[PDB]
Design a protein around this ligand. Structure first.
Ligand SMILES: O=P(O)(O)OC[C@H]1O[C@H](n2cnc3ccccc32)[C@H](O)[C@@H]1O
Ligand SMILES: O=P(O)(O)OC[C@H]1O[C@H](n2cnc3ccccc32)[C@H](O)[C@@H]1O
Ligand SMILES: O=C(O)c1cccnc1
Ligand SMILES: O=C(O)c1cccnc1
Lengths: 346, 346
């Protein structure tokens, strides 16, 4: 794992410089395409992209797992829904499946800890049948977290060898906005009440209990903010760890990764804490309607492109933003040049 | 024209009700897909869509024209660029062409007043070789504005008969952010300094002159805020009128129209002033980087989906948002249902 984090490539400044120059000469007022231009330059700096903004095959990775903290009454969805919805993923009827199909991306459903019998068609990487209840102890051991990180990392970069150049991250697990909120509180240093949201339609009355649970998790486990792996293993979850692993894997592979919503933000905070070199490869998608979204994004210093008030998860937001990444590439490769039109602009 | 505005259909509440019920039963926590859900319901209410959110052929209409106010030094792009870039539109090398191609939409270039010889391949609807300089008088006569509105309206709804179900509006005309700013000031009641921007890279030093020009245009012409046609003809432009016409045409046709940037906002303010029934058919795309964008959007009571810091125009933002409209339809038609999975959620 040390090898992994060590071998994460830095961005290619040379390719980025040539990219900027090329974009500046396109048939348009310089800088008029704003963030679409900065996005194209960002992509060009990613080694896995061969010095130019391009998109080959696309894949969305959905990490599924159950959480012991569900027993604390922090989620209104039946715990069984995790397993049921995971199966639906293999049938292409879920929200991320439909949006991914629209973007021409393939969805990979990965079981990293569902509390049910194995589901046929789902990638098996389960650590255990659900993680421990973070309210009374750690979710898992440091060893289990590191092992999963390596496993998911390898799998992710392995897909790159199959033609995948753009990744999307997602999750599925009832009650996961609780550990997500806990990690955000720890990494950000914000009070629980400020980052705890309604998740999947949690009644407003039951909000106070969720906040108490998060505080208990932090007080009991005492996660060290300076150690991303410590935080993940103590008040995180298998699914959250998995998402972090996708981020580390793509970064090592020198490829871009599209974040999704609130759950992904917590995983990205952990990933950046573990390896700052991962940051240049992250691409925001939408602005989650979860209460702690603004705080989490501020600390990641990211400004989402899409404001859809979305809060479904599954990687649905990431899939929805893929067309935007492709647009930046289209702009870069298909637009004409000012010089060819004899047009001169300041 | 009175007939036109009179025959604009109201939204189909019955279809919208069935739409909401269907969306609520999809394989996801109720309301979790946020604005994507509200968008699907909006589409369902549009009569031209046959009671369901759907998208057939897509078209982006780019209205091109020159402005006399260019002589006041409010634009740094050579006046000839309007004609040159209009020709490039027919070659598919411009920004809107590339983004439209990515969305699978066809671009229609319409000349409503370019100050140059006719351009082959461009739809000819020119009123005159550029409009009058709004700083010393009106841009055109009320008659010319009404005639163009009718002509563009008919053309727009005529495309609907060819299979087009989703429209995008755009423009091309050096110095058009000046009359656009003037209209925004008048309709909104805001001071010129608050809504005048840099347009296509206007030097910061030259901003004061642009503001003075806008004030002069308003003082000299005395446009009546309560009369959208009066405002358009006095301190507007041929291109701006054309965009308004696309909005009225699609609304009459009961079809959705995607707005673009700042220029489109001014046209939408005029359209809504002329016929409030047009509002339900308008769909925002991105949030323009032009200074007066926030003010204009507030008065239209619209919240763009995309935050790309874009400021190119041409209808590039509208094309970029088309995939989002298609996603709402995909969600509506392709997602599975909770009942079929025996899943129950509050
Ligand atoms: O903390 P919570 O309140 O439980 O909210 C997080 C959960 O809701 C989302 N989620 C995504 N798809 C879903 C289908 C059914 C139910 C929930 C679903 C997340 O993917 C996760 O499963
Ligand atoms: O008021 P202004 O400062 O002139 O800014 C408005 C102009 O810039 C944009 N615009 C769009 N495509 C362009 C290509 C070359 C130059 C400008 C262009 C608008 O479409 C319009 O032509
Ligand atoms: O932002 C998300 O991804 C999210 C928010 C609430 C519930 N589930 C997912
Ligand atoms: O918002 C726009 O469409 C825009 C802003 C500046 C210059 N041209 C177009």
């Amino acid at each position: 794992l040390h090898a992994l984090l060590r071998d994460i490539p830095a961005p290619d400044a040379e390719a980025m410089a040539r990219t900027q120059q090329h974009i500046d000469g396109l048939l348009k007022p310089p800088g008029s395409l704003g963030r679409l231009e900065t996005l194209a330059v960002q992509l060009a700096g990613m080694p896995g992209l061969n010095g130019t903004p391009q998109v080959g095959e696309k894949a969305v990775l959905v990490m599924c797992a159950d959480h012991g903290v569900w027993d604390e009454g922090v989620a209104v969805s039946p715990k069984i829904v995790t397993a049921i919805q995971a199966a639906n993923m293999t049938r292409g009827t879920t929200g991320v499946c439909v949006l991914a199909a629209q973007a021409g991306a393939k969805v990979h459903v990965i079981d990293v800890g569902i509390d049910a019998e194995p589901i046929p068609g789902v990638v098996n990487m389960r650590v255990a049948r659900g993680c421990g209840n973070i309210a009374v102890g750690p979710a898992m051991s440091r060893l289990q977290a590191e092992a999963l990180l390596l496993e998911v990392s390898r799998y992710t970069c392995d897909l790159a060898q199959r033609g995948v150049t753009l990744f999307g991250v997602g999750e599925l697990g009832m009650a996961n906005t609780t550990p997500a909120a806990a990690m955000v509180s720890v990494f950000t240093g914000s009070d629980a009440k400020e980052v705890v949201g309604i998740g999947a339609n949690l009644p407003p009355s039951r909000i106070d209990n969720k906040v108490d649970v998060v505080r208990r998790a932090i007080a009991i486990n005492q996660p060290n903010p300076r150690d991303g792996i410590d935080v993940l293993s103590k008040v995180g979850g298998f699914d959250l760890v998995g998402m972090t692993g996708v981020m580390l894997g793509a970064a090592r592979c020198g490829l871009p990764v599209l974040l999704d919503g609130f759950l992904s933000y917590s995983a990205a905070l952990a990933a950046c804490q573990i390896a700052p070199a991962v940051r240049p490869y992250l691409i925001p998608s939408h602005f989650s309607a979860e209460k702690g979204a603004r705080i989490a994004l501020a600390h990641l210093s990211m400004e989402p492109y899409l404001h859809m008030a979305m809060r479904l998860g599954e990687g649905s937001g990431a899939a929805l933003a893929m067309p935007i990444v492709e647009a930046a590439c289209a702009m870069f490769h298909n637009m004409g040049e000012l010089a060819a039109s004899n047009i001169v602009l300041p």
